[PDB]
Amino acid sequence: LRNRVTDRYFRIQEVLKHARHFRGRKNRCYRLAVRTVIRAFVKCTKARYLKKKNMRTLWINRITAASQEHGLKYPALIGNLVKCQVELNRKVLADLAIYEPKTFKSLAALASRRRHEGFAAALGDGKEPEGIFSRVVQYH
Amino acid sequence: PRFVSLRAKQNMIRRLEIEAENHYWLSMPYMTREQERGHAAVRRREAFEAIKAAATSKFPPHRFIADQLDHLNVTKKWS
Amino acid sequence: TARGTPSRFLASVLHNGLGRYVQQLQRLSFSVSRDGASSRGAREFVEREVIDFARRNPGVVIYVNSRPCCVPRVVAEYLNGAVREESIHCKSVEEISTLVQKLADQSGLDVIRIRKPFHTDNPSIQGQWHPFTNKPTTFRGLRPREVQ
Amino acid sequence: KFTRSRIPEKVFQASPEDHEKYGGDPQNPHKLHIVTRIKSTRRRPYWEKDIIKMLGLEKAHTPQVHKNIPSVNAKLKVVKHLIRIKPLKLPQGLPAEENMSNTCLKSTGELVVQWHLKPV
Amino acid sequence: ISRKWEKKNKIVYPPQLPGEPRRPAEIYHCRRQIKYSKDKMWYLAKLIRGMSIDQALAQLEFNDKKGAKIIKEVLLEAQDMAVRDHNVEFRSNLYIAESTSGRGQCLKRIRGIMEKVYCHYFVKLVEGPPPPPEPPKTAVAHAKEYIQQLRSRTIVHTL
Amino acid sequence: SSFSRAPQQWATFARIWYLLDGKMQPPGKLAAMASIRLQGLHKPVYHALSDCGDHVVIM
Amino acid sequence: TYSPLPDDYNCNVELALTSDGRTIVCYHPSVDIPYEHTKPIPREEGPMIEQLSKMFFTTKHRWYPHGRYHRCRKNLNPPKDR
Amino acid sequence: VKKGFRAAFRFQKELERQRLLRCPPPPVRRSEKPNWDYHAEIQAFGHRLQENFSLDLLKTAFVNSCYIKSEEAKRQQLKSNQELSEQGTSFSQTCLTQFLEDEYPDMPTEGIKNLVDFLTGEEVVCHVARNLAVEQLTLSEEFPVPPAVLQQTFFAVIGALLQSSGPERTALFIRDFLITQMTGKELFEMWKIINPMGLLVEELKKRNVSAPESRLTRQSGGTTALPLYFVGLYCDKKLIAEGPGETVLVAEEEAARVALRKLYGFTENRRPWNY
């Protein structure tokens, strides 16, 4: 052996510090811990996309629930708040739904008011005055 | 067996509408083909003489005394 | 990974922006070899940049130890008693300056995972949702199938 | 065999119903196209992939300005199913060197040469 | 070979103070190269793990297994050096805190490899009455645990 | 608002008994409302692991 | 006499635009519970696990214990917030 | 025997780390470790907080009286701390009562005394002075610095900033370190009381309002192991507070606490401290 390898405890220990909490011999034996540690890092990076996705469906569940408390449905609320140029997002609306339910109730009132102006505007068709909350703020 | 929903029909239809308006705006050119001829030959020739020129100006970089001597600083010490 | 690492909540040290801002970095401890090729960029950092750095923040006390080291280190100590020991081994002066300003700018809290990107201490202003918000009451407090 | 498809010329002749539908004038047409790739060139023939590379449309949903000349219109007729075409309309003039930086192409298709961020 | 358990009777503590409770004694004893296997000693070692040494002796005199006599010699020997060597006044006032059994240096006999199996036996005796066994948790403990888990919970993934 | 920590926490996650008369009703359209109130999906505090379901009494 | 939501139970929501039409002012003070809407204050392992299940309306499985590998993986000093 | 040196050195230091985690040494004070210049680091403690001191006076603010006595126990083989700590805690008590009387005018003065005896308590002041490097500069006898000693040194540092640069800059100091400790804490986490209902009854006698009727507003799960009640508290058939609870008595006491926060301005919606 001219130069055989001295520094091999540390390569093993670079893998096995990630496996210290596994079950079975995966926390101990390097051959098993490499497949599970690699496989854990692949899951760890593919789960960034699923973290973002699952937060957003969680927010739609919370906005859905809190807007069904006021009679609205979720598509009615989000559509007719886009139509009011209230460009809040789902994270903020879910957090207002939990922590500030009067602001959420007034946003549900603004979205159902805009929903009814959309109904009455798209019912009596032709040239008419627009709704009050139906007006848009032009940016130039 | 796979069947066609209403999502798929409405999606297919709005692609057909984008397509029909692409048909409309391609139906009225600002120039005829006799008018366009050579109307941008100069800029195309200068653009290729730039591509040609960057191709034929490829050569090794300059080598300097200061870099080779500046490797001697790896044993700079204090006094 | 996050399940193998510990995590924490986002915090400050003693409400560090509320009244005034306090530099959370107490001590730096440079140790620089006199003759030694690994602490070359440390040497040119003590000669050029450490006096300017020591004047740009006087609440930081800086110790340059200058012993025969074989790896040079910087040891940041923080007001909450944390110690970050980082190496300045085979680094240029500019890389050491961005590292030392990195240690200056931060606090002693761990660089473990932070759970939420925010920390309110008073999250609710209109009163948090309980299931009897958004419900109407009845006359005399009755419930369903209550006769009197 | 799947081959390259010629399209006849009656397909590209407008009707006055279409001038009532879209907003076009057959006399005095528009100079500049805005072309936008909105359907991938993957699962398309290699010639359509090439025409998308020539037109400068490798990013989806990014507008590109072209000339309304029959050569550019010929390449656009090859890939007309992948793109979207609008006329570049210009409400004010084309930008001079004073207004060169402060432009914004809006989503209507118009290119405004004074883009403040203040409401009207 | 490691021999750390014999050394554990050599820790000398600095002397106490009069405003300080009396530290109980700790008597680490072992026997090495018992010709028996380490997993048959686990039942005998496990049997006596919180008992007083009189209850342990009494349970090991009437057990049929081979290791019971060996463990009884280890516990009578550790009761002796408990009193003589380590200043335990009452022979009776001991209990088994630790009783384990590791593997010893086995032999290999070629027949076809067959191991002659050896074991050790490690006992720490602690001066004092044996600690009271853990009571099974009641429905008050389960109900308080459940409700304290309900009190613990937060609105998650929000402010 | 202005509750202490413990009664606010009790008030939010406390579970509510609902009554639901199923006379002349279809079973799946009762089952949808019952299922939403059994999972806690009618609460804006909802999360799967946080265990905020309610009780549904269907008569 | 129009109300976009039945302003009865949580807060009395009164929407407004301003004269410029740029900001939406919401005005929503709290609805107190009336005094009329109130009531006066009135003045073995097997059977234990069935009794706890039936008490707290959960199944039986969360009352059985768990092994040491699960009791010691647990974080006993978890991070607190708020 | 693999020839070489670097893996044996790295392995030697990892063995040193497992020696430090298995049997860690008792913590030594910082002035008994390398890289300590005491004077330079008192000046750093001055410039850290963004104020100036007369440095000898701050030096006596860190010198306890136990340290002189055990030091003269070590001589046989310095001004004390107590004057500055007397001035500093007298001043900080009266200036905290100034701030908390100005920004909470409706509080009872028993409540202002319990707030001020929270913001100068040993738990608060010892939590503050272990993160301002006071403890590392304290010349004390024993390590870790015991909490009564460190409370004394912290108010000695306040007294030294008082004699340095007047009452206004110490008022800003006390504002920025002692008052910010009551952010995020509720009133009855600071001023503990038993029987809040009787206290609310007495306060409503002082405003000449009748005694409030506790009156069950909403409930749920009444015959279960997890009830929920909202007891309200009405005064002339208008409620002043309503709070939840697991039993009726718990919710009634807690509604009394909500009313006491509402009388005193110490609600969760109060105007925050203007810094």
Tell whether F6 is within 8 A of chain C (Cβ). no
State both tokens at H181.
């400790």
State both tokens at H63.
């010198």
State both tokens at A84.
């009011």
State both tokens at A61.
């569940």
The 3-state DSSP class for residue E100 equals strand
Angle at alpha carbon of residue A127, lines to A126 and A130, rounded to 5°: 110
Q: Which of G50, G54, G55 to mutate to test the interface with E (most CBs of E within 10 A)?
A: G55
| Strand bridging mode F17-20 / F55-58 | parallel
**Pairwise CA distance, residues H201 & E33, whole Å:** 79
Residues of A in contact with G13 (CB under 8 A): 102, 105-106, 109
* CB contact (8 A) between residue A7 and residue H6: yes
Angle separating helix axes A90-99 and A101-121, nearest 10 degrees:
120
Nearest residue to H53 (alpha-carbon basis) of H173, H149, H150: H173
Q: Specify the CATH number for the domain of residue E97.
A: 3.90.470.10
Residues of G in contact with A21 (CB under 8 A): 73
- Classify the C-alpha dihedral C8-C9-C12-C17 as positive or negative: positive
Closest residue of chain C to F20, computed from CA coordinates:
C144
* CB contact (8 A) between residue C37 and residue B78: no
**Pairwise CA distance, residues A23 & A45, whole Å:** 21
Residues of C in contact with A103 (CB under 8 A): 126
Tell whether C120 is within 8 A of chain F (Cβ). no
**Number of domains chain C contains:** 1
* Contact (CB, 8 A) for E9 and E87: no
Phi-psi sector, H35: left (phi>0), alpha (psi -120 to 50), beta:
left
**Which of the 8 DSSP states describes residue D33?**
E
CA A63, chain centre distance (Å) = 12
Q: Specify the CATH number for the domain of residue C88.
A: 3.40.30.10
Q: Quick one: which H or E segment has residue G14? A: strand G14-17
* CB contact (8 A) between residue C4 and residue A103: no
* CB contact (8 A) between residue G52 and residue E143: yes
The amino acid at residue H250 is V
| Strand bridging mode C61-64 / C25-31 | parallel
Residue with tokens 């100005």: H102
Angle at alpha carbon of residue G38, lines to G34 and G40, rounded to 5°: 135
Burial (0-12, 13-18, 19+ Cβ within 10 Å), H240: buried
- Classify the C-alpha dihedral D18-D20-D23-D28 as positive or negative: positive
Please report the residues numbered 20 through 49 in chain C whose beta carbons come closer than 8 angstroms to any beta carbon of chain H. 20, 22-23, 26-27, 29
- Classify the C-alpha dihedral H54-H55-H58-H63 as positive or negative: negative
Tell whether F39 is within 8 A of chain A (Cβ). no
Nearest residue to A115 (alpha-carbon basis) of A88, A65, A77, A87: A77
The 3-state DSSP class for residue B28 equals coil
Count the neighbouring beta carbons within 10 Å of the beta carbon of residue D115.
15
Q: What is the DSSP string of G16-74?
A: EE-SSS--EEEE--B-PPPGGG-EEPP--HHHHHHHHHHHHT--STTTS---HHHHHSS
CB pairs under 8 A between B and D: 65
- Classify the C-alpha dihedral H173-H187-F5-A103 as positive or negative: negative
- φ, ψ for residue A18, nearest 5 deg: -90, -15
State both tokens at C85.
């020991």
**Number of domains chain E contains:** 1
Angle at alpha carbon of residue H233, lines to H230 and H237, rounded to 5°: 120
* Contact (CB, 8 A) for E144 and E72: no
Q: What is the DSSP string of D59-71?
A: SBT--EEEE-SHH
Resolution, angstroms, 1 dp:
3.0
**Pairwise CA distance, residues H128 & H112, whole Å:** 21
Tell whether A42 is within 8 A of chain F (Cβ). no
CA atoms within 13 A on the CB side of A39: 8
Contacts of F33-42 with CB under 8 Å at 24 or more apart are: F34/F58, F41/A61, F41/A64, F41/A65, F42/A65, F42/A68, F42/A69
Angle at alpha carbon of residue D76, lines to D72 and D80, rounded to 5°: 170
**Pairwise CA distance, residues C138 & A72, whole Å:** 23
* CB contact (8 A) between residue C130 and residue F8: yes
Q: Using CB atoms, which residue from H188, H246, H268 is nearest to F10? A: H246
* All residues at 6 or more sequence positions from H60 whose CB lies less than 8 Å from its CB, including other chains: H78, H79, H80, H81, H84, H156, H160
For chain E, the chains sharing at least 3 beta-carbon pairs closer than 8 angstroms are: A, C, F, G, H
**Pairwise CA distance, residues H129 & H150, whole Å:** 7
Residues of F in contact with E148 (CB under 8 A): none
* Contact (CB, 8 A) for H110 and H134: no
State both tokens at H78.
């310095």
Query: In this complex, does chain D touch chain H, defined as having at least 3 beta-carbon pairs under 8 Å apart?
Result: no
Residues of H in contact with F11 (CB under 8 A): 228, 230, 244
Residue with tokens 């010198």: H63
Q: Using CB atoms, which residue from H214, H218, H225 is nearest to G41? A: H214
Residues of H in contact with G82 (CB under 8 A): 184
**Pairwise CA distance, residues D76 & B34, whole Å:** 19
* Contact (CB, 8 A) for C52 and C85: no
Q: CA dist C25 to C75, C81, C82, H154, Å?
A: 11, 10, 10, 20
**Number of domains chain D contains:** 1
Radius of gyration of chain C (CA): 26
Q: CA dist C57 to G3, H215, H247, Å?
A: 60, 61, 57
State both tokens at G37.
């809407």
- Bond preceding residue E136 cis, omega within 30 of 0: no
For chain C, the chains sharing at least 3 beta-carbon pairs closer than 8 angstroms are: A, B, E, F, G, H
Phi-psi sector, G9: left (phi>0), alpha (psi -120 to 50), beta:
alpha
- Classify the C-alpha dihedral A17-A22-A23-A29 as positive or negative: negative
**Pairwise CA distance, residues D72 & H125, whole Å:** 77
* Contact (CB, 8 A) for H128 and H177: yes
Outline where chain F has alpha helix (H): 5-13, 27-39
State both tokens at F3.
């509750």
The 3-state DSSP class for residue A140 equals coil
Q: Quick one: which H or E segment has residue B19? A: helix B6-25
* All residues at 6 or more sequence positions from H193 whose CB lies less than 8 Å from its CB, including other chains: H199
* Contact (CB, 8 A) for D100 and D106: no
Q: What is the DSSP string of E31-98?
A: EEEESS-TTTHHHHHHHTTTSBHHHHHHHHSS--SHHHHHHHHHHHHHHHHHHHHH----SSSEEEEE
Query: In this complex, does chain D touch chain E, defined as having at least 3 beta-carbon pairs under 8 Å apart?
Result: no
| Strand bridging mode E26-34 / E119-127 | antiparallel
Q: Using CB atoms, which residue from G37, G81, G82 is nearest to C141? A: G37
Q: For residue C147, what are the domain limits?
A: 1-148
Tell whether A112 is within 8 A of chain G (Cβ). yes
**Pairwise CA distance, residues A45 & C2, whole Å:** 11
Closest residue of chain C to G81, computed from CA coordinates:
C9
Q: CA dist D19 to B18, B23, D83, Å?
A: 16, 12, 21
The 3-state DSSP class for residue E126 equals strand
Tell whether F44 is within 8 A of chain C (Cβ). yes
Q: For residue E36, what are the domain limits?
A: 1-159
State both tokens at A114.
């805009």
Nearest residue to C22 (alpha-carbon basis) of H164, H132, H134, H120: H132
Closest residue of chain D to B19, computed from CA coordinates:
D81
* Contact (CB, 8 A) for C142 and C35: no
Count the neighbouring beta carbons within 10 Å of the beta carbon of residue E51.
18
* Contact (CB, 8 A) for G34 and C137: yes
The 3-state DSSP class for residue E29 equals strand
**Pairwise CA distance, residues A95 & C26, whole Å:** 38
Distance to chain E for H226, nearest Cα, Å: 9
Burial (0-12, 13-18, 19+ Cβ within 10 Å), H88: buried
Which residues precede gaps in chain E, with C-N > 2.5 A? 111
Distance to chain A for C6, nearest Cα, Å: 12
* All residues at 6 or more sequence positions from E114 whose CB lies less than 8 Å from its CB, including other chains: E108
Count the neighbouring beta carbons within 10 Å of the beta carbon of residue B59.
6
Residue with tokens 């002066």: C93
**Pairwise CA distance, residues G24 & G10, whole Å:** 20
Q: How big is chain H, counted in residues?
A: 275
Residue with tokens 């926390």: A27
Nearest residue to F12 (alpha-carbon basis) of H244, A66, H184, A101: H244
* Contact (CB, 8 A) for E101 and E49: no
List H233's β-bridge partners, or say none: H214, H241
Q: Which of A52, A61, A95, A104 to mutate to test the interface with E (most CBs of E within 10 A)?
A: A95
Residues of C in contact with H44 (CB under 8 A): 26, 58-61
Tell whether F46 is within 8 A of chain H (Cβ). no
Outline where chain H has alpha helix (H): 6-22, 38-48, 55-61, 66-75, 82-102, 109-119, 122-129, 147-177, 187-190, 196-206, 248-263
Q: What is the DSSP string of H247-274?
A: SHHHHHHHHHHHHHHHHTT-STTSPPP-
Q: What is the DSSP string of H225-239?
A: SS-EEEEEEESSSSE
Residues of A in contact with G17 (CB under 8 A): 132-133
List D57's β-bridge partners, or say none: none
Please report the residues numbered 189 through 228 in chain H whose beta carbons come closer than 8 angstroms to any beta carbon of chain E. 225-226
**Which of the 8 DSSP states describes residue D80?**
T
User: Residue by residue, what is the 3-state secondary structure of chain C?
Assistant: CCCCCCEECCCCCCCCCCCCCCCCEEEEEEECCCCCHHHHHHHHHHHHCHHHHHHHCCCCEEEECCCCCCCCEEEEEECCCCEEEEECCCCCHHHHHHHHHHHHHCCCCCCCEECCCCCCCCCCCCCCCCCCCCCCCCHHHCCCCCCC
Q: What is the largest CA-CA distance in chain D?
A: 58
* CB contact (8 A) between residue C134 and residue A101: yes
* CB contact (8 A) between residue B75 and residue C34: no
Q: Which of H192, H254, H257 to mutate to test the interface with F (most CBs of F within 10 A)?
A: H254
Q: For residue D51, what are the domain limits?
A: 1-120
Q: Which of H1, H3, H6, H269 to mutate to test the interface with A (most CBs of A within 10 A)?
A: H3
CA atoms within 13 A on the CB side of H241: 26
* All residues at 6 or more sequence positions from A105 whose CB lies less than 8 Å from its CB, including other chains: A70, C134, G5, G10, G11, G13, G28
**Pairwise CA distance, residues H83 & H155, whole Å:** 10
